[PDB]
Nucleic acid binder design. Structure first.
Ligand SMILES: [Mg+2]
Ligand SMILES: [Mg+2]
Ligand SMILES: [Mg+2]
Ligand SMILES: [Mg+2]
Ligand SMILES: [Mg+2]
Ligand SMILES: [Mg+2]
Ligand SMILES: [Mg+2]
Ligand SMILES: [Mg+2]
Ligand SMILES: [Mg+2]
Ligand SMILES: [Mg+2]
Ligand SMILES: [Mg+2]
Ligand SMILES: [Mg+2]
Ligand SMILES: [Mg+2]
Ligand SMILES: [Mg+2]
Ligand SMILES: [Mg+2]
Ligand SMILES: [Mg+2]
Ligand SMILES: [Mg+2]
Ligand SMILES: [Mg+2]
Ligand SMILES: [Zn+2]
Ligand SMILES: [Zn+2]
Lengths: 222, 118, 97, 51, 43, 59, 162, 38, 38
RNA sequence: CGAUGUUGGAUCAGGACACCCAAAUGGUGCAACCGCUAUUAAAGGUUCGUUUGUUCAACGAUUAAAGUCCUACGUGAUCUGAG
RNA sequence: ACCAUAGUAGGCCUAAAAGCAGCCAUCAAUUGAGAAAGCGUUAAAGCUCAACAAAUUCACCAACAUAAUCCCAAAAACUAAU
């Protein structure tokens, strides 16, 4: 004998038309003629934009920073589109089409001579940004199962999350940092310039607080 | 660029337990510092080198005494990682002119006026 | 009940189970009864009859099984556990037959 | 009172004598040595000297 | 047999050297002296 | 040289020559734990039964 | 402790359960409120692989670990005691708890190498041919990390790898 | 010299490593484990 | 047998076993499901 | 740069294993013979010719096989000098 | 571990679509078992899942080969170390 439990029911879910992901273009329609310098600073540190959910209850969350080029968009589009029930689920791009020109030279060039030519386009993705947002009358578990594939084939480390999962790990993140037993935290030492440590740190560190190092992000770092 | 550094005032707002901990009186600030230079100025920026020079802190592990006024506290704040600061104490009070020769400074940071009677 | 089905019970003549329902120790022998009474084991051979002897007073539960080796296997479940009876049954009645 | 490799500290237990009997014992010993000095029964002395 | 590429402590690839319990102790003791230091600078 | 002053014997069989020079014996650097059969029955009954096994359960 | 007996008489086989006497938990525990058997005797973080009088209480006459729901151990401590029991078997303590096999005592093998505190099984470990230098160095495990919480009287943490 | 952001994880100046190692999270340790409590 | 970085059961009859300091997947029905963790 | 003489051969080979042969095995869309894959194993082996300065490559005949590489593209105070 | 019977080959399109190419409904007997979550069939039949009953230690994720003369200090889990 086992007693039953009430099943979660979705009466409030409204499925939009064209639930499957839009095709995105290899190159923008108005190709950038002027060659841009590479901010690596756009992959660096925490993300400001696209941190929260909008319509959907599920998402892929980026744990590192990285560049997304057309190959990745293709991968996600196909993989998600044939992995979903178009009736019961819908997906959404939380990331723009690749807009940032990246140059190259022909292999075999000597150093110098000018900048290179535009090879392809990418999208910058800062750690903590939602890549793809899936809603529906789905339970998190199915979506999670096939979303983790996609997540795994992305250039940065990433996870599949729900609203519940995300707020879980955020409350855990702050609770870990008010639980902390040792008096010595990165913030505390860095801001007050103890041991003259500011010599070895970068200015950005004051904001990043030793959680972010380069494009990498370690969540365990308080 | 590595530069000089601001130190937010919040750092210098003491918590009520700190008084108990380091042995300072909640009510009255101490009058004088005994500053000692604990670290070396080498591998540090020129401006810290200068601050150390103008505090009389040139020689290591030698004590020096300074007013506890803000003018001084500013410089000390710049080099605070190079030094040890302990409050001067006067159990026997300040020395008179008869007591100048017999004065000595004990490591607990206290100035004894009569040293070695008979 | 499955491990008995895989083992081809057809080497057995007659299986009786004598037990006393109101005793506290009889659950094991009962488990054995429902393991041998199942459709798989029951249909492996139709030459074998399964008899349930039910008494209040006898006070000692018992399992008796005859097979065509001229062999008689009698296990008195008292303190014996179900799957010990069924393992003993398996290695005893299969290896010989 | 069980016994495991750990639950008992791995070093001899110590018992230091009561302070009173000790003070007595000390005064007694000092008395003895002092007699040795007064009698001139020490042979030859060495001394560690700061100079 | 396991070489360190280029120069030991310099380049993209460096000799891995680990932090010692000793070093943690030392650093922490310094920190403590500094916390006290900026207590006495406070009033 | 000081490797020549080291004498190693696999078992205890030593030339009586070498036995006759021995001044003293160093204490063994590890305390050897006794097996279960080394303990006196006094020591076995002195140590508590920690848990109480069901009578039905078979060992 | 319930022995199962089997008898062969004249093409009839009798199998019967028979109950013997089980020793009982010693009368007066230090922490009676305590939940798990290790804990109410205040043995948590105290027993080692070396303490046999404790370990032999959970195992079978044939040397294998007793199951957990019977013993009542707190899960963590169950794992610790299992590690310890393995380590103690390997160390050559509990020589009486092997299975008895009249033939196999006769065929000598090279006299048992004395070992202690062994985390892995001997047959499963590849010799480390390559060692490695000061910076990348292959360390050899000693004891188990399950016991890294034992009380240290020296104050220095036990050294688990050399 | 390497850029600020890189692919390969970028070995830290030793002093920064010491910082990282001192400032690690320490989880609170209860006096008695809640499981071994009643 | 295949040497793999990740072991996964390819059917209901696969079982998972630790031998020689490794993990293994043995399968009686389809021997092609045999796997050795590297 | 007050000289670290350079391609291919000859001679003699040292080494790695990411095994071409020989050994031991797992899987097969493995019946058998062949095979195709994968694991372990490096003590010993790994041909002779036509053309090219050639390394490669093509072709003839074979082999249990005619391994992939490293050694200042091993080896000119041992040789060669076709390039 | 255990167990699997009912309207019924549910209605369609197709040579056949019998829980399981596809499209639509997704009701209903029995204490209990989806117009079926995996395999399987030409369409079936046939194996399992979820359902009753039987019981109940704990069970979310986590594992990743290598080079060329010869491995590369030796060793070591406790007698008290801010
Ligand atoms: Mg990735
Ligand atoms: Mg070098
Ligand atoms: Mg380098
Ligand atoms: Mg630079
Ligand atoms: Mg030159
Ligand atoms: Mg020269
Ligand atoms: Mg050779
Ligand atoms: Mg190999
Ligand atoms: Mg072969
Ligand atoms: Mg060879
Ligand atoms: Mg080259
Ligand atoms: Mg050459
Ligand atoms: Mg040459
Ligand atoms: Mg010559
Ligand atoms: Mg030469
Ligand atoms: Mg079922
Ligand atoms: Mg390999
Ligand atoms: Mg060596
Ligand atoms: Zn416990
Ligand atoms: Zn399988």
């Amino acid at each position: 004998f086992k007693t039953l439990l009430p099943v979660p029911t979705f009466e409030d879910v409204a499925i939009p038309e064209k639930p499957k992901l839009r095709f995105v273009e290899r190159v923008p329609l108005v190709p950038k003629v002027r060659r841009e310098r590479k901010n690596l600073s756009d992959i660096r540190g925490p993300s400001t934009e696209a941190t929260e959910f909008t319509e959907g209850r599920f998402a892929i969350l980026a744990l590192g920073g990285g560049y997304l080029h057309w190959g990745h968009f293709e991968m996600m589009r196909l993989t998600i589109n044939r992995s979903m029930d178009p009736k019961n689920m819908f997906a959404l791009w939380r990331v723009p089409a690749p807009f940032k020109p990246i140059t190259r030279k022909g292999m075999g060039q000597r150093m110098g001579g000018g900048k290179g030519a535009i090879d392809h386009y990418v999208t910058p993705v800062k750690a903590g940004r939602l890549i793809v947002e899936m809603g529906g009358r789905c339970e998190f578990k199915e979506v999670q199962g096939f979303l983790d594939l996609v997540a795994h084939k992305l250039p940065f480390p990433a996870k599949a999350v729900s609203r519940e999962t995300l707020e879980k790990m955020r409350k855990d993140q702050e609770e870990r940092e008010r639980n902390n037993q040792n008096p010595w935290t990165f913030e505390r030492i860095a801001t007050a310039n103890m041991l003259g440590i500011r010599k070895v740190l970068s200015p950005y560190d004051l904001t990043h607080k030793g959680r972010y190092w380069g494009k990498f992000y370690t969540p365990e770092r308080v | 660029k590595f530069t000089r550094s601001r130190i937010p005032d919040k750092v210098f707002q003491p918590s009520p337990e700190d008084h108990e901990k380091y042995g300072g009186d909640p009510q009255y600030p101490h009058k004088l510092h005994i500053v000692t230079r604990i670290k070396s100025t080498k591998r540090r920026p020129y401006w810290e080198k200068d601050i150390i020079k103008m505090l009389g802190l040139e020689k290591a592990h030698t004590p020096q005494v300074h007013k506890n006024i803000p003018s001084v506290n500013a410089k000390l704040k710049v080099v605070k990682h190079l030094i040890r600061i302990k409050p001067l104490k006067l159990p026997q009070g300040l020395p008179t002119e008869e007591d100048m020769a017999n004065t000595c400074l004990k490591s607990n940071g206290e100035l004894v006026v009569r040293w070695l009677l008979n | 009940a499955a491990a008995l089905a895989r083992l081809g019970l057809r080497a057995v003549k007659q299986v009786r189970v004598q037990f006393c329902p109101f005793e506290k120790n009889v659950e094991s022998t009962r488990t054995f009864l429902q393991a041998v009474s199942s459709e798989k084991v029951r249909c492996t051979n139709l030459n074998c009859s399964v008899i349930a002897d039910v008494r209040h007073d006898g006070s000692e539960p018992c399992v008796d099984v005859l097979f065509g080796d001229g062999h008689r296997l009698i296990m008195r479940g008292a303190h014996l556990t179900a799957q010990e009876m069924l393992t003993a049954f398996a290695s005893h009645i299969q290896a010989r037959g | 009172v069980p016994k495991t490799s750990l639950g008992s500290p791995p070093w001899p237990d110590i018992v230091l004598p009561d302070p009173v009997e000790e003070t007595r014992h000390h005064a007694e010993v000092v008395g003895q040595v002092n007699e040795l000095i007064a009698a001139g029964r020490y042979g030859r002395l060495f001394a560690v000297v700061h100079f | 047999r396991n070489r360190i590429p280029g120069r030991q402590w310099i380049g993209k690839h460096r000799r891995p050297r680990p932090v010692s319990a000793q070093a943690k102790q030392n650093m922490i003791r310094r920190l403590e002296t500094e916390a006290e230091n900026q207590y006495w600078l406070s009033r | 040289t000081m490797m020549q002053r080291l004498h190693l014997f696999p078992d205890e069989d030593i030339p009586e020559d070498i036995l006759k020079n021995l001044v003293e014996e160093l204490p063994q650097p590890r305390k050897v734990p006794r097996r279960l059969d080394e303990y006196t029955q006094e020591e076995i009954e002195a140590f508590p039964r920690v848990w109480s096994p069901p009578e039905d359960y078979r060992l | 402790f319930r022995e199962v007996v089997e008898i062969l008489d004249g093409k009839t086989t009798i199998i019967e359960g028979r109950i013997t006497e089980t020793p009982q938990e010693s009368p007066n525990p230090p922490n009676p409120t305590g939940q798990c058997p290790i804990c109410r005797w205040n043995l948590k973080h105290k027993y080692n692989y070396e303490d046999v009088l404790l370990l032999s209480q959970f195992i079978r006459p044939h040397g294998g670990m007793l199951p957990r729901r019977i013993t009542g151990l707190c899960q963590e401590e169950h794992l610790k005691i299992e590690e310890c029991v393995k380590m103690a078997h390997r160390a050559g303590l509990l020589p009486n708890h092997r299975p008895k096999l009249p033939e196999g005592f006769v065929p000598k093998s090279k006299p048992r190498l004395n070992r202690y505190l062994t985390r892995w099984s001997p047959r499963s470990v590849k010799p480390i041919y390559n060692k490695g230098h000061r910076w990348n160095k292959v360390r050899m495990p000693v004891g188990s990390p399950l016991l890294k919480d034992n009380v240290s009287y020296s104050g220095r943490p036990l050294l688990l790898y050399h | 010299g390497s850029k600020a952001v890189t692919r390969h994880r970028r070995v830290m100046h030793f002093e920064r490593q010491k910082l990282m190692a001192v400032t690690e999270y320490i989880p609170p340790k209860p006096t008695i484990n809640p499981r071994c409590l009643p | 047998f295949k040497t793999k970085g990740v072991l996964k059961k390819r059917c209901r009859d696969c079982y998972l076993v630790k031998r020689r300091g490794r993990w293994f997947i043995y399968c009686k029905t389809n021997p092609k499901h045999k796997q050795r963790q590297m």
